[PDB]
Amino acid sequence: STPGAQQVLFRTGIAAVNSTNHLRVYFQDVYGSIRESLYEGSWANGTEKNVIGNAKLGSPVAATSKELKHIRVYTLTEGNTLQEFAYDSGTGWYNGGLGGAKFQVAPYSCIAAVFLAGTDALQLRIYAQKPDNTIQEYMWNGDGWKEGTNLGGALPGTGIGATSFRYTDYNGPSIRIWFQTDDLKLVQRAYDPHKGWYPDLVTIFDRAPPRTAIAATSFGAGNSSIYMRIYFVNSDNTIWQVCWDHGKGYHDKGTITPVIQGSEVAIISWGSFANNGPDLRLYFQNGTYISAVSEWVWNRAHGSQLGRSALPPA
Amino acid sequence: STPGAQQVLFRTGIAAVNSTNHLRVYFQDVYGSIRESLYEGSWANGTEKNVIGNAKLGSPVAATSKELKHIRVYTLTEGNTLQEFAYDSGTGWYNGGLGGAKFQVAPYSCIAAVFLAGTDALQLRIYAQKPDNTIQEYMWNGDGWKEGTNLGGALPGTGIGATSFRYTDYNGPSIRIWFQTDDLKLVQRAYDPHKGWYPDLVTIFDRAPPRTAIAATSFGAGNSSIYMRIYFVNSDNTIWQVCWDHGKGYHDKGTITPVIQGSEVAIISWGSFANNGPDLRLYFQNGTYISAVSEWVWNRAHGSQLGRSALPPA
Ligand SMILES: CO[C@H]1O[C@@H](C)[C@@H](O)[C@@H](O)[C@@H]1O
Ligand SMILES: CO[C@H]1O[C@@H](C)[C@@H](O)[C@@H](O)[C@@H]1O
Ligand SMILES: CO[C@H]1O[C@@H](C)[C@@H](O)[C@@H](O)[C@@H]1O
Ligand SMILES: CO[C@H]1O[C@@H](C)[C@@H](O)[C@@H](O)[C@@H]1O
Ligand SMILES: CO[C@H]1O[C@@H](C)[C@@H](O)[C@@H](O)[C@@H]1O
Ligand SMILES: CO[C@H]1O[C@@H](C)[C@@H](O)[C@@H](O)[C@@H]1O
Ligand SMILES: [Ca+2]
């Protein structure tokens, strides 16, 4: 290993955001501190000088952004409430408003977060698991945090993926979230602006490891059209990818890359097929320097490639 | 799942102690507390009322005993020192003195612990990983806790298994310990009353997942004779067993039972091949009610069977 690598928690929560190919990746160090590693041309940071906050050891770590102007990072306090580390361009990092609502969740709750697409307003939808094991939406729409829709039961400790997009032939944002049911399927729930929440859960994978990590992204929103990608850790100890392409629907899955048993996963994307895209970046642990975070890359030039062997501070 | 199962930490550290078929199991709950579950003809406890202490979330949990008269449970504090919860008959549960020494270990250390075999005196050896990634022994022999032998480099965050037996043709205890080296190998180091620690690393398995759970037992000490079992979580997500049998040395290995990705493991034993045993019991997570601990059993009557499916408080 290396001294940097050793600072990184084994099975740390992982999250990432970006503006095109400007990248931020958050993880937890062995002491519980949440750090940010950074890529602008080259990889950097991720040290103890790069701490944005502290959270319970073993915390889930989620993030979403509007480019790199507005960033938000979600984790649990020791007392198992939802908190929020916020970055605003021209202000720097501070302690978000989420924490004051004291939203109490299961100790094993995971967390997903999205800024709603197609608006310049700041509209956040955060998802986590209550003590009754239901999935619960929390909204921020410019007058304070509140509970949104309850999307009902799931496997205790389930992974949670989420994404927002805006169809161009609609005048509101859509949302998809993914999670695990008691029978260990992975399913999607779905919100659209005319329909509201559809009542149905739609299987995307028949049987996955319990509490397996789930992460999602979307690109190329058009007219009733979208391209989605959901990733999870499978029984073979590799990340699997599951594709939605418009018209085909949920039409393929397969393996992508090897990970350590119980790795978390973060996904980001930019561009679309129209403009020599998309680009995809996946983050996870695969044993590099034992405990380092690693990167997998998809692009048009070279397709499916391992990226940065080990992220800062490794 | 069950409101009881949901209380056990996923990938919790696990230790076990016994006198014959009188069993204690220790584990961590989602809040950080170390809880005891018990088997006296039937299985009980493991509730919020059965808490012997707190530890850093994610802590290793190791345990050793002199039958059930003296029990010692070793974990790490939030500040990464070795700590100890003590039970002596007639006294109850207390914090032992190990905490007092403020032995700092790598945040990612595991722990192994043994009482030396074949003396009524309480003689304790703990093994942990120091921040320089060597395995350090710590001793208690009635005169306060101190450093013992240092045992060389190991993979940052190796599992450590330990056992102590006494050959009857000898005047004191033998020790064996097991851990993982940077090359991913699994190795044995050995101590013997007539030669001290042998210099040499013996390989017991060529390549295991990094930081795999390792746990170990011995039974049937006679004249220059012993039996030993070592257990680990292999790349196929099952506990594998490595077999030392008197006359053959190390000579067999294979799979035993499936476990969840990154499960910890504890092993206890009693009896012998000459008095109609031995008896073995593994504890681990295989996914029963998601997060419950399960058990596996070997006896002469029925050999290999799963046992208590979900341990209390499940
Ligand atoms: C072209 O691949 C590169 O894309 C960058 C945005 C960043 O992810 C780098 O680590 C990759 O090697
Ligand atoms: C240039 O790096 C900065 O980018 C911002 C968008 C945010 O990630 C900050 O934490 C970094 O220091
Ligand atoms: C305005 O609140 C609504 O926003 C939608 C986008 C969706 O999150 C619904 O659950 C909320 O009730
Ligand atoms: C025969 O197996 C039993 O042995 C007991 C001592 C204990 O390990 C139980 O959980 C098993 O069912
Ligand atoms: C009789 O039950 C007790 O057994 C002791 C050996 C110790 O494990 C205590 O924690 C239990 O309450
Ligand atoms: C008395 O100290 C010794 O005890 C032995 C049994 C063994 O643990 C050695 O490491 C120590 O130097
Ligand atoms: Ca740039």
Side-chain angles (χ1 to χ4, degrees), chain A residues 1-194 196-314, chain B:
Chain A
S1 194
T2 84
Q6 296 172 2
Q7 278 158 45
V8 180
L9 188 58
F10 204 65
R11 310 197 172 93
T12 179
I14 317 183
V17 297
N18 68 299
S19 171
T20 58
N21 61 354
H22 297 95
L23 319 185
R24 303 297 183 261
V25 189
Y26 306 92
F27 58 97
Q28 190 173 235
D29 66 11
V30 288
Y31 307 109
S33 285
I34 301 298
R35 307 189 187 174
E36 187 192 71
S37 290
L38 160 164
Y39 179 97
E40 301 245 337
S42 75
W43 283 101
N45 287 180
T47 76
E48 53 195 286
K49 300 160 87 177
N50 295 124
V51 169
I52 55 156
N54 298 93
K56 69 188 291 205
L57 277 175
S59 175
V61 174
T64 178
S65 71
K66 289 170 92 46
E67 304 302 302
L68 297 169
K69 188 177 171 215
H70 298 291
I71 311 176
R72 299 289 185 278
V73 179
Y74 300 92
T75 62
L76 313 182
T77 58
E78 279 165 323
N80 293 309
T81 51
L82 281 183
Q83 65 175 358
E84 174 187 51
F85 302 150
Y87 178 100
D88 289 339
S89 192
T91 298
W93 288 98
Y94 59 91
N95 200 246
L98 185 48
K102 298 295 223 181
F103 289 129
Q104 171 60 228
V105 296
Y108 45 77
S109 186
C110 230
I111 300 165
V114 290
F115 277 110
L116 300 169
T119 189
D120 285 333
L122 273 79
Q123 286 176 1
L124 284 153
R125 290 302 184 279
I126 304 312
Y127 301 92
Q129 186 166 51
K130 289 202 172 197
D132 65 10
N133 296 323
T134 64
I135 301 287
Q136 175 61 64
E137 181 171 61
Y138 306 91
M139 341 196 284
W140 167 280
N141 298 308
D143 203 353
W145 288 97
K146 76 186 76 173
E147 288 189 341
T149 316
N150 188 94
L151 303 160
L155 186 147
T158 180
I160 313 192
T163 192
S164 186
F165 51 83
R166 169 125 171 181
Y167 289 136
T168 55
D169 59 318
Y170 286 90
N171 44 228
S174 291
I175 325 170
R176 297 305 174 257
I177 88 200
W178 294 270
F179 55 84
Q180 201 161 37
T181 52
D182 287 329
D183 54 6
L184 313 182
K185 280 179 287 139
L186 306 178
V187 302
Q188 160 205 102
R189 297 205 63 185
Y191 173 101
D192 281 342
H194 61 307
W197 289 101
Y198 300 92
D200 63 306
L201 295 56
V202 179
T203 307
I204 72 167
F205 203 74
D206 297 322
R207 199 187 147 82
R211 305 215 173 157
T212 179
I214 310 181
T217 182
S218 63
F219 55 99
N223 289 309
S224 304
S225 73
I226 195 59
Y227 295 87
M228 303 181 304
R229 302 281 185 280
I230 311 95
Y231 300 80
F232 72 92
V233 188
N234 206 355
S235 98
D236 57 356
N237 301 330
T238 68
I239 287 172
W240 275 47
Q241 170 181 68
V242 174
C243 310
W244 172 282
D245 295 344
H246 172 85
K248 302 203 71 177
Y250 284 122
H251 76 266
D252 196 26
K253 40 255 205 316
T255 194
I256 298 293
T257 199
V259 294
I260 58 159
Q261 299 177 15
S263 169
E264 305 288 351
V265 190
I267 178 63
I268 49 162
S269 67
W270 74 95
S272 65
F273 293 124
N275 288 135
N276 306 267
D279 269 79
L280 309 174
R281 302 297 189 285
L282 245 194
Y283 302 95
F284 47 91
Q285 291 169 290
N286 78 6
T288 305
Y289 301 144
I290 314 307
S291 55
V293 175
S294 290
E295 187 188 52
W296 175 83
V297 169
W298 200 93
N299 63 197
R300 287 287 283 282
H302 296 286
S304 155
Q305 303 298 3
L306 277 186
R308 187 49 190 237
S309 200
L311 267 67
Chain B
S1 206
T2 73
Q6 287 163 19
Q7 273 157 44
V8 172
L9 173 63
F10 202 70
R11 306 179 167 99
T12 164
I14 306 152
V17 300
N18 64 307
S19 189
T20 72
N21 71 346
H22 299 251
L23 318 184
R24 304 288 189 269
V25 170
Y26 305 87
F27 69 89
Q28 182 163 57
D29 83 11
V30 284
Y31 305 105
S33 299
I34 303 278
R35 278 184 194 187
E36 180 187 66
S37 298
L38 139 166
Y39 185 85
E40 286 302 332
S42 70
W43 277 109
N45 294 183
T47 65
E48 55 166 36
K49 294 171 146 199
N50 306 118
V51 170
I52 74 175
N54 310 118
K56 77 182 300 201
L57 263 176
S59 188
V61 179
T64 193
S65 80
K66 296 186 71 66
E67 307 298 325
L68 291 189
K69 192 195 191 178
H70 305 296
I71 308 177
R72 300 295 184 264
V73 174
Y74 300 97
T75 64
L76 301 179
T77 69
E78 273 182 290
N80 300 300
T81 46
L82 291 166
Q83 68 177 345
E84 173 188 51
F85 312 137
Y87 178 97
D88 303 309
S89 316
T91 298
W93 279 102
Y94 60 99
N95 301 326
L98 181 50
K102 279 185 100 195
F103 292 131
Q104 203 85 194
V105 295
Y108 51 77
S109 190
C110 261
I111 305 163
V114 301
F115 275 100
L116 300 169
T119 164
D120 306 354
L122 285 31
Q123 295 196 308
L124 281 159
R125 299 291 187 279
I126 309 310
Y127 309 76
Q129 214 179 4
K130 292 171 102 175
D132 72 334
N133 297 319
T134 72
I135 307 304
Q136 182 60 61
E137 176 189 57
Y138 308 93
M139 299 185 312
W140 159 277
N141 298 114
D143 194 40
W145 282 92
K146 37 190 75 159
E147 285 197 343
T149 306
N150 184 99
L151 287 172
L155 185 140
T158 181
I160 313 162
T163 192
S164 179
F165 57 103
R166 175 150 167 204
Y167 295 132
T168 46
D169 57 332
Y170 280 94
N171 76 134
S174 293
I175 314 166
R176 305 288 182 286
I177 70 140
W178 287 270
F179 50 90
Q180 183 180 37
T181 56
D182 284 311
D183 60 359
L184 300 187
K185 289 195 224 341
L186 296 192
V187 317
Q188 184 212 78
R189 291 213 70 180
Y191 172 89
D192 261 345
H194 67 274
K195 278 189 172 157
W197 295 96
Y198 300 88
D200 69 80
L201 272 58
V202 174
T203 303
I204 63 156
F205 196 80
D206 307 322
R207 186 194 209 78
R211 297 194 186 180
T212 183
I214 302 182
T217 204
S218 48
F219 58 87
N223 286 355
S224 274
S225 59
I226 190 62
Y227 301 81
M228 309 182 298
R229 305 299 191 249
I230 308 98
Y231 299 95
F232 71 94
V233 175
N234 199 355
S235 67
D236 58 20
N237 300 328
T238 64
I239 294 172
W240 274 52
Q241 175 192 73
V242 181
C243 286
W244 174 283
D245 298 309
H246 171 69
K248 313 183 91 67
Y250 284 114
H251 78 270
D252 198 50
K253 54 211 192 278
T255 192
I256 292 292
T257 187
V259 299
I260 68 171
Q261 274 170 41
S263 166
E264 300 297 333
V265 177
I267 176 68
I268 40 157
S269 62
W270 65 96
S272 48
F273 289 124
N275 296 126
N276 333 309
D279 270 83
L280 309 180
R281 305 292 190 261
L282 290 166
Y283 305 98
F284 48 85
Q285 276 165 331
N286 63 11
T288 296
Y289 301 136
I290 313 312
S291 57
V293 181
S294 293
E295 171 189 76
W296 174 94
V297 167
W298 193 95
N299 62 196
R300 289 285 282 288
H302 314 315
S304 133
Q305 308 296 342
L306 285 184
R308 175 68 172 224
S309 198
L311 263 79

